[PDB]
Symmetry: D2
Subunit: 119 residues, 4 copies
Amino acid sequence: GITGTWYNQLGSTFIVTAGADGALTGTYVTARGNAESRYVLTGRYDSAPATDGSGTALGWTVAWKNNYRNAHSATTWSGQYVGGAEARINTQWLLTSGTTEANAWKSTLVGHDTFTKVK
Amino acid sequence: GITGTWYNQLGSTFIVTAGADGALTGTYVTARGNAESRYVLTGRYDSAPATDGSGTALGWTVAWKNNYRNAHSATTWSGQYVGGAEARINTQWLLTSGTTEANAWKSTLVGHDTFTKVK
Amino acid sequence: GITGTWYNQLGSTFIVTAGADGALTGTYVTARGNAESRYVLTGRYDSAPATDGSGTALGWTVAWKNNYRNAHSATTWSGQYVGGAEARINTQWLLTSGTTEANAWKSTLVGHDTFTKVKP
Amino acid sequence: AGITGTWYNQLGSTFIVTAGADGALTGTYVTARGNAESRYVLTGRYDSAPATDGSGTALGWTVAWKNNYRNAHSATTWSGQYVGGAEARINTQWLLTSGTTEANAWKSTLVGHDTFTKVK
């Protein structure tokens, strides 16, 4: 149920393969949809989830460097897959920027994102 | 730099290798430190950080399932490596459990961990 | 604008008054809705926001103790009010429970709530 | 309780609070510069009947970053626990939300952690 293409509310797209061993690998593409807008992702999921209607736990990381650009920052998503007709990945994320020690206090943004199988 | 053996405040161990293409791979071992406590990690880091004194942004995920136990949860760590003598990795983390839709609102914990090369 | 009765997605009600000095005072009602589910809230908001089409920053706290129960915990919401056609207050929140030292690493939940003046 | 008094964080900030019998926290927060222009009102709540098993006392507070001398259009909320004793401490996480346009709300909220002690 996880492997495939997911869309968030703001225009982003994440293509992921969920391997049998717990691995997530894919590419995350930012709103521009550009080759310059593609980044690698890697994560982990619960490959033996409860079958009692509970969600499947997962997280992934994107570092925001590719061959064309580098924002010197890393986003991690933590969340759960929810299957069925209303299939959704519900997440919270933390975005950390590389800063100097004095600015370290304001290094990390926190948000949330919901992903769906259609836009 | 990043490649190595790090320890958090509480006794967990993070064995990581940082690769040229921006990959983090390794093993996370919880405080007990036996075989049943070893978990696979994956992540990313900025492989070309700023040269001005800023940290190196990075993130990883551990799904809390191995061959012996499955907690049906995943933590992601978002942070930065600060080099020099007294190298440290300062993070924030999100731990999400798989839950029913009714309990989702309390599926995620947040905290902070600091890692150093000394135990 | 902020003053009034607001509702989240999960059934709760935030009854708030925005004071001229930047105070928020009021009552937070969890989903059950009877008198054992009413708690005091206090908070602060930016009483002179920017005129560039930005939101209005605010936050508040509720400690989960009233005369009927005590959960030994407290939630704070940090957020912004966005006015407009369908006025809303977008927030993230942190819930901390009282714990021992050995358990303080799992003391804090994180989540987000969207409040509207229209009840779901 | 325990909580009433002056608390210092590592970055040079100071907060002076009074804990009321009914769960009120009121006071002032002073950022590192230390003068009038660096002083802000704080309001919050705490568990006035904590457990007696040695757990912490849950609490939280909010500061909106506006005084009579300046306005940053943001507010911070701290959620945490007081832990009493000889080395008393308030351990917190915080969220700092800034007022922004809709296009930038995704990037409105910083999260971090602060520990407050009674010695500077």
